Design a protein around this ligand. Sequence first.
Ligand SMILES: COc1ccc(/C=C2\SC(=O)N(CC(=O)O)C2=O)cc1
Ligand SMILES: COc1ccc(/C=C2\SC(=O)N(CC(=O)O)C2=O)cc1
Ligand SMILES: COc1ccc(/C=C2\SC(=O)N(CC(=O)O)C2=O)cc1
Ligand SMILES: COc1ccc(/C=C2\SC(=O)N(CC(=O)O)C2=O)cc1
Ligand SMILES: COc1ccc(/C=C2\SC(=O)N(CC(=O)O)C2=O)cc1
Ligand SMILES: COc1ccc(/C=C2\SC(=O)N(CC(=O)O)C2=O)cc1
Ligand SMILES: COc1ccc(/C=C2\SC(=O)N(CC(=O)O)C2=O)cc1
Ligand SMILES: COc1ccc(/C=C2\SC(=O)N(CC(=O)O)C2=O)cc1
Ligand SMILES: [Cl-]
Ligand SMILES: [Cl-]
Ligand SMILES: [Cl-]
Ligand SMILES: [Cl-]
Ligand SMILES: [Cl-]
Ligand SMILES: [Cl-]
Lengths: 311, 307, 311, 307
Amino acid sequence: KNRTNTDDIRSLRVITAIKTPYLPDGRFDLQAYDDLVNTQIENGAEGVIVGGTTGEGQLMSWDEHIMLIGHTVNCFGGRIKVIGNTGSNSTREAIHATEQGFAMGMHGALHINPYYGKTSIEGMNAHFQTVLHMGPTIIYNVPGRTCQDIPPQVIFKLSQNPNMAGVKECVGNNRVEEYTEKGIVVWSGNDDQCHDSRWDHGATGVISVTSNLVPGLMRKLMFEGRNSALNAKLLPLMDWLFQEPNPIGVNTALAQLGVARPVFRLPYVPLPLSKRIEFVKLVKEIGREHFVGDRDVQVLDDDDFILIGRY
Amino acid sequence: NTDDIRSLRVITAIKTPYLPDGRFDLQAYDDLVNTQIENGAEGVIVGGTTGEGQLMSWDEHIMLIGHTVNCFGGRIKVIGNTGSNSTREAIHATEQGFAMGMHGALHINPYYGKTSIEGMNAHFQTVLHMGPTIIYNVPGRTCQDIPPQVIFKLSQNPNMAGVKECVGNNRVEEYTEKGIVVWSGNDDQCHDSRWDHGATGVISVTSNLVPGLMRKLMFEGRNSALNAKLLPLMDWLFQEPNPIGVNTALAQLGVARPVFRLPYVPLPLSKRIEFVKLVKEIGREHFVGDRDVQVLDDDDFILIGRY
Amino acid sequence: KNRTNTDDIRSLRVITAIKTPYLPDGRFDLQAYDDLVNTQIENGAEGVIVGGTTGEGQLMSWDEHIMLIGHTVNCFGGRIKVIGNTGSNSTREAIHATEQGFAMGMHGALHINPYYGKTSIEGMNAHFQTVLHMGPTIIYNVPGRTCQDIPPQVIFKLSQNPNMAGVKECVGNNRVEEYTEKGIVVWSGNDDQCHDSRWDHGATGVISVTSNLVPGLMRKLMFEGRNSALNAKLLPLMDWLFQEPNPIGVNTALAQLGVARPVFRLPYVPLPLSKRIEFVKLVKEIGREHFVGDRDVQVLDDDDFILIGRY
Amino acid sequence: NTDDIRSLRVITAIKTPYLPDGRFDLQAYDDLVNTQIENGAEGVIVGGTTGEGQLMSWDEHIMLIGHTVNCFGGRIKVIGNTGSNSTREAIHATEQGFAMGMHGALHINPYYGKTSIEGMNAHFQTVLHMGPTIIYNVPGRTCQDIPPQVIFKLSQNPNMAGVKECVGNNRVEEYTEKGIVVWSGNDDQCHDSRWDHGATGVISVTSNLVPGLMRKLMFEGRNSALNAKLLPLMDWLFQEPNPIGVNTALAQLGVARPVFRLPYVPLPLSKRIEFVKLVKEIGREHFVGDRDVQVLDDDDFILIGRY
Ligand SMILES: COc1ccc(/C=C2\SC(=O)N(CC(=O)O)C2=O)cc1
Ligand SMILES: COc1ccc(/C=C2\SC(=O)N(CC(=O)O)C2=O)cc1
Ligand SMILES: COc1ccc(/C=C2\SC(=O)N(CC(=O)O)C2=O)cc1
Ligand SMILES: COc1ccc(/C=C2\SC(=O)N(CC(=O)O)C2=O)cc1
Ligand SMILES: COc1ccc(/C=C2\SC(=O)N(CC(=O)O)C2=O)cc1
Ligand SMILES: COc1ccc(/C=C2\SC(=O)N(CC(=O)O)C2=O)cc1
Ligand SMILES: COc1ccc(/C=C2\SC(=O)N(CC(=O)O)C2=O)cc1
Ligand SMILES: COc1ccc(/C=C2\SC(=O)N(CC(=O)O)C2=O)cc1
Ligand SMILES: [Cl-]
Ligand SMILES: [Cl-]
Ligand SMILES: [Cl-]
Ligand SMILES: [Cl-]
Ligand SMILES: [Cl-]
Ligand SMILES: [Cl-]
């Protein structure tokens, strides 16, 4: 019913938080975006978050956001689950974005707790209750960005709603175990923990940044059983990706791989030259064929980069 | 002018009151600002966190700033909260706020979508040039501390009025001892910041309730007894994240309707009972409005998501 | 190429300018809307204009507009051609709406010349040139509403662009003939002329209001050859529909037929009581089975009607 | 007050000038308004058709009104164009315009999506109560005449200041003889309307160019010779739909940049040559700005769709 739709989200192991690429004037580069999503599908990504933090949703106008979701459903909705990031620190915005995203056929919603303008436990519950009934929902707990832990009592209460698909959890393995042991579906939101969460702590899978770069490896990591060697091989890449706040790393890497133009909407700027040289090295160690795109990786010069505040 | 901002000691982060349908209650808002002016508030932040700026549409945001300037601009400095975690938004909001004649802008570092030091600087540089700016460091909400090196660099811009600082007295002192203007962002620390650490003043929530006392606290010299008298009120206000407390208190005082834009909801019954007690201990005449304080029933509160 | 897509629009004979139904609080009633579109499909409507004048596009927020298009493509795009009304008297708006509507998978755009803020012939050309390249486009000439005839020299110039599908023409049969005789595809925008335009003046078909009520009859009228008797039978209905400006009639009729709630976004208000009584009579003469819905037609009381300015 | 609006004789429908990137040129805009004030314009419509209101975003619309009020509100009456063919939009724009302190609203009947007489009345009734309102009848643009019966009914509302009428002198006289304030909306008829038909004044495009002359025309009594002197300039201005002419002329006079938001484009070269001639016949000192009038090349013009 609504049951089957929620179940469809719950069964996904590899969800890519897809990067939004830009044209030199700062508008969406839909061609490059379409290529990224095709690559994700071809390498076994089962879902995509559209316009999340990795996708710089907070930098979009609301129409762009609604357009990108609609676009993703229309082009790829039969080949991958499309999960719109329709959350907000404003309940009103979360309501409208969520209903519009479902009306347009997205398969689920990702909902963060109100950040910056944080609220009480009662308010957080009230917030989630306005959107939980609209369709399959992933609750996103990322206290390092929201500055407010979504406590277990909120998660467990929400999980009585059949539309609550599960949790993107970033607090760690202990918090993951706490939920999975009670049968709540958890996706790890931390690339560098998702192997252990998957195989040691009952996590269903990952909502991933790293899969933007190496979707095949991330798929292996989530499906083919424990593999501490593969996990260790990815760690330097993951450390490189998160040395500045996401999505600064993935934006830089995808430019370097030639699959997105070197165009940044502020307030994001690329990793400096020395870090770009590091990246070339990491690609060589892991093998360029494992990374998205066909073009030889480039370091890029500082002045290849376009930084835009007005677009 | 920047110097005009720099000399302010009492800036109120004004609450935005609502009509039962969720729209702004301009009449109540006007009354709150008048009350602030009458009791010596020298500035107002319009549509900051206390003002629930993040729940406004952009037009309501621009309208409220313009409205405040038109009605009160000759009587109080009007500082628009025109910041955002989006550089594009901050740019547009700031230049529109200035074009409407606001006296200054309050800019936070990008929250949630946090960036690098270089990205933070870039962000600030797109707006700092547009007019007098207060930089807002509130790491407990942004989850990213604006480091001293950033502040010192921004302070070379003559449009940088100063810092609303929340880290504490040591960070306050680090700036004020270098002649950087600081307003404390923490009501429960602002007395000590003001008299012991060189802070110019406070950007205050508590002044929404007791503007007279907060004025005394900032102008009339050290007074640890007044400070101690206010602490229970401050502790009550901040037991849930601002502005839940001030929203609840202003409803209880009868100066704002009991109408909350989600995701905020009022303090529970027992806390409202506590509030009535605190008003009696401090004395009702010190709190905004004339109406006898009420406890209110839970069903008095309107919680709105669609407005 | 782009050729095939334009050709797909050109081959449509029955395009319904679909009414947008509302809930009592003034929001879209997507359930009722979905039922209307299903009815249109089941009775041989081949295309739908989403958010045109009949659909009260001018009363929508931009996100609602983008949402409705995306929604229509997602739910019905495989069963009917979805033509977004993405035009505007503002070139900037027309540009954004058009590209967003195409990104979301709509099959064509309907573009009016700038109304109210009318421009020169040169400006009208410049306006159309910004959006013509984005995909299959129907140019809409309705001088009775725009207060500015799109002259033949503009139409003929635009028709050199392979994305120009054809014209929704309202000036009349002579203007229709002028274009069709040169091989330009024309849809009549006047229900009470579309039979003659179709069979006597080379028009491909109709972009229709009346088909909201009697889709089967309108389909017959456009496919099954000349039929002056059927045409005469529909005339009283069409006269009733247009006695106040569209969409006042169709909003009233659909309420009366029980397929849309009696909810009007201002500045539209329903036809008065005596006209609603007339409508019941017209349904009886033509036969209720020919009209959309299953519910017995009602007159409705004045106070069944909800009129909303704030929604 | 409504009476304050009613007494205005010269209202300029002010042009909105642009920067090369398509954004508002506030500096040039401020200069245009100053010039209007200096030469006796008593009101300004902000973001009407001449002001290309239909090309603005809603925030730019709200910002420009607020800006005009803040900068010029003490020196000139500011009438926001807050109307729309959407009742919801008109409601929001009007109440936000008033909250920002505009003196009046100009409301058109719903155009393009035209409605019934009853719908038109309903539309007007949602906004008339909010403050002093000028009702705008321009059937050549709306494709729907506001009938006298509608005007007479609205005129019972004390907030109805009057009518900007474009139908002609007979319609003007029909209202003014009943003591309804009318401003002519047709520059080439406003002299006769003013002196022969009881019109109070003009809501003018031509005053953007020659504000001094338009003032004389409205205040200093019948002057068929001045009227005849202006007619060639008026005929030039309106050979393409307003504001194509005024946009072109202000670019030629050097007081606005040659930047057009689509779907407007400038008059062709030969018309710009005509313009230079008309300026010489009338005398350059009568036209806004100090710069010698230029013809400009076609490639001087920036046409923008994405701004
Ligand atoms: C994704 O969620 C949202 C996206 C956009 C909005 C925009 C609004 S709300 C409103 O009334 N106005 C007009 C005004 O306030 O004047 C807006 O433009 C609200 C929610
Ligand atoms: C105030 O702190 C809390 C209050 C309530 C809870 C709720 C819990 S804990 C748990 O495992 N389950 C599932 C079960 O036991 O079936 C819950 O629903 C947690 C924290
Ligand atoms: C080397 O790094 C940079 C050097 C210069 C810039 C300049 C920018 S970015 C932006 O939004 N604006 C405002 C505007 O474009 O109006 C600028 O001036 C950015 C980065
Ligand atoms: C406070 O600053 C801002 C407020 C609103 C915006 C929104 C924009 S910009 C643009 O082009 N569009 C149309 C579209 O992208 O569909 C928008 O809706 C940007 C900045
Ligand atoms: C369908 O086409 C459009 C829909 C919406 C827009 C909205 C705009 S444009 C812009 O800059 N801003 C922010 C500001 O101006 O502050 C907006 O909100 C433009 C086009
Ligand atoms: C200034 O008036 C006009 C100027 C040019 C035209 C263009 C025409 S007329 C016609 O039939 N065709 C097709 C053809 O002849 O192949 C045209 O392209 C019409 C009016
Ligand atoms: C019998 O016909 C009618 C009777 C009363 C109304 C009232 C309305 S409609 C609207 O927008 N507003 C403004 C608001 O709701 O704020 C009203 O007061 C409409 C029609
Ligand atoms: C000038 O008056 C208006 C200006 C803008 C609006 C836009 C609105 S209202 C609303 O809810 N939303 C969000 C949504 O519908 O997605 C909007 O964008 C309405 C009136
Ligand atoms: Cl692989
Ligand atoms: Cl308001
Ligand atoms: Cl006191
Ligand atoms: Cl049939
Ligand atoms: Cl501006
Ligand atoms: Cl003069």
